[PDB]
């Protein structure tokens, strides 16, 4: 049972640096290099170089020299990527990957992301959204939640505690003023609305704040 | 320098079908040394395939490898729903790795248009300065979709943004969000907010619209 165990999620501003770590288990961590590849938000994957496993030396490719490093614990099974002077486009998933050589690799960390920026910790305003005219369409009637300018992510958006699974479209956040916003959306029957109350649930474990905002009639 | 171009983009299929990923390598005879990885969404990629021709230990042999040099292919002999993913295909044969953007595998439905929804401003919004109005473009296939923002018949891109999720589980359609934000002054010196979609499905414009003097 070959495995790749790779540290948690981290922040950091831009100027700092962050170091991740990739912890082997099953095999014989010296008989095999160790690479690590970058994967952008949107993007295809981009290999930045490897690491000699017995000699403990890092081939670099040309776009990730000079502000990166490899390195190891030999007695640990682990291998490190330290990234220094972090600017924003190193916002990104690192993967470690087990090397086989002219094979390239096989077994893959499971990622860590990296997030650089200089917002800090901020609650989101959280917007019920009611319909007007042309927002219903047959028995269907759509109803909405707008969340704006939080960091970090994540937030957990549900509908009546989660009992409002059926019909809803939450969506990625996108950044905004080096801040975030996601909207969701919620359909049901217009005879369930507003008869029936309905209500969008916004939890924000980074400031610890929970919020339901019911949406009511214009 | 070495580029590994993958064909098509995208490619959309229902279960049993065998499809056909195509690789093709710029330089040398790259000889076999070609690899192809499965990624699914918020996950590591996983190996399938090593030197062009093996399977690895764990993959099913519907996936098969095949081609040398400068041509491969990555073979499903009948496509399974769990086979939903993006698929790479790297070369190991020269330094540095490189990596070909990836086929995206989509589940095949009938088309089906967005049902649209605006929503102006809530009065919360509005009470601290802010004017975001909101437009739902939901459960449509397939995926293509352009969509405009249009202030009282004049369009408008600035203040826009969008986010859109991926194939649904059940459906298997899209949706998207596209909000135009502004400040509450700006807001109120004009009267109608419109947004409307092009879309496969429909020949003319999907609209949707309000008018803050309409009650």
């Known amino acids: 049972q070959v495995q790749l165990m790779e540290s948690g999620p981290e922040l950091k501003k831009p100027g700092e640096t962050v170091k991740i770590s990739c912890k082997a288990s099953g095999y014989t961590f010296t008989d095999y290099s160790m690479h690590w590849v970058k994967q952008a938000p949107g993007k295809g994957l981009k290999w930045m170089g490897w690491?000699?496993?017995?000699?403990?030396?890092?081939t670099f490719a040309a776009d990730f020299k000079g502000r990166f490093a490899f390195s190891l614990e030999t007695s640990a099974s682990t291998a490190y990527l330290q990234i220094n002077n972090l600017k924003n486009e190193d916002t990104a998933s690192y993967f470690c990957?087990?090397?086989?050589?002219?094979?390239?690799?096989?077994?893959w960390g499971q990622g860590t992301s990296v997030t650089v920026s200089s917002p800090k910790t901020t609650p989101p305003s959280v917007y019920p959204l009611a319909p007007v005219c042309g927002d219903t369409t047959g028995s269907m009637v759509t109803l909405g939640c707008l969340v704006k300018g939080y960091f970090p992510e994540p937030v957990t958006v549900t509908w009546n505690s989660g009992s409002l699974s059926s019909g809803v479209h939450t969506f990625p956040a996108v950044l905004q003023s080096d801040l975030y916003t996601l909207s969701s959306s919620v359909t049901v029957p217009s005879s369930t609305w507003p008869s029936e109350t309905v209500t969008c649930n916004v939890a924000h474990p980074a400031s610890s704040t929970k919020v339901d905002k019911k949406i009511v009639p214009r | 320098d070495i580029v590994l171009t993958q064909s098509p983009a995208s490619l959309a299929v229902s279960l049993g079908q065998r499809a056909t990923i195509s690789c093709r390598a710029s330089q040398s005879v790259s000889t076999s040394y070609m690899h192809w990885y499965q990624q699914k969404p918020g996950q590591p990629p996983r190996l399938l395939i090593y030197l062009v021709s093996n399977l690895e230990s764990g993959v099913p042999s519907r996936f098969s490898g095949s081609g040398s040099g400068t041509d491969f292919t990555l073979n499903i002999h009948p496509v399974e729903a769990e086979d939903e993913a993006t698929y790479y295909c790297q070369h190991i044969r020269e330094l540095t790795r490189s990596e070909a953007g990836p086929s995206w595998l989509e589940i095949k439905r009938a088309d089906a248009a967005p049902t649209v929804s605006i929503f102006p401003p809530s009065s919360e919004q509005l009470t601290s300065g802010g004017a975001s109005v909101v437009c739902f473009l939901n459960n449509f296939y397939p995926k293509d979709i352009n969509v405009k923002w249009k202030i009282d018949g004049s369009e408008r891109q600035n203040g826009v943004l969008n986010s859109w999720t991926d194939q649904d589980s059940k459906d298997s359609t899209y949706s998207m969000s596209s909000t135009l934000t502004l400040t509450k002054d700006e807001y109120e010196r004009h009267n109608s907010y419109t947004c409307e979609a092009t879309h496969k499905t429909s020949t003319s414009p999907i609209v949707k619209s309000f008018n803050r003097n309409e009650c």
């Open positions: 690491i000699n496993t017995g000699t403990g030396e890092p």
């Open positions: 990957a087990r090397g086989v050589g002219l094979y390239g690799v096989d077994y």
